[PDB]
Structures are given as C-alpha cells and as structure tokens.
Amino acid sequence: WSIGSTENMIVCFNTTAILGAMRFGLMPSVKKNFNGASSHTAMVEQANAKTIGSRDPSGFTAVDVLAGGSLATIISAGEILAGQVPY
C-alpha cells in the first residue's frame, strides 16, 4: 500500500464520490433523505435535522461527513477484498 496505489485510489475515489453525492442532494443525507418522502425519485428536507449546525453553504454536517466516510470505507472494503478471497 502507498499513496497512488490502487487500494488508496479506490477508497479516495469512493469517499469523494459519496460525499459529493450527499452534499449536492444526490444521496440521502442528514438534512435531506427519504424520511417522510413520497416516492423513490424524490427526497425531502428533514425538519428535525434542519439547521443541526454547519458552516457549509449547502448545510453539510459532520454527521453527514461521518456517514459518507463510513459508507465509503464499507464499499471500498467490499471492492478491494474482492480478488483477495483464496478460492
């Protein structure tokens, strides 16, 4: 493992993509998700988590960061450990 290695690049790409997705409303986030929504194609702003504390102009939160990082690490684990199984 090193900077620029395949595993490092996989995880960095995964976390960047996930955080961008839930920052711009492409993935369910703290301030906007399917809780109390209508259909699969539309998420809604969560009043309970609305203005829960952020200095990012889209309202991106630390819990959003932690959730996206956890999901990205989970996905990176799944993808990297594919091809490491013995068989």
Query: Residue 15 binds which entry of ligand BCR, another protein, ligand CLA, none, with Cβ cut-offs from 5 to 8 Å by kind?
Result: ligand BCR
Q: Which of 33, 58, 69, 75 touches another protein (CB under 8 A)?
A: 33
Query: Residue 69 binds which entry of ligand CLA, ligand BCR, another protein, none, with Cβ cut-offs from 5 to 8 Å by kind?
Result: ligand BCR
Query: Residue 35 binds which entry of another protein, ligand CLA, ligand BCR, none, with Cβ cut-offs from 5 to 8 Å by kind?
Result: another protein
**Dihedral through CA 54, CA 23, CA 73, CA 6, nearest 10?**
-130
- Residue 23 labelled as part of a binding site: yes
Report the alpha-carbon distance of residue 84 to residue 42 in Å, rounded.
38
Task: Please list every residue from 21 through 80 that binds ligand CLA, using CB under 6 A.
Answer: 74-75, 77-79
- Residue 55 labelled as part of a binding site: yes
Tell me the β-bridge partners of 36. none
For residues 57 and 63, the answer to whether their CB atoms sit within 8 Å is no
Helix spans in the chain (H): 6-23, 62-81
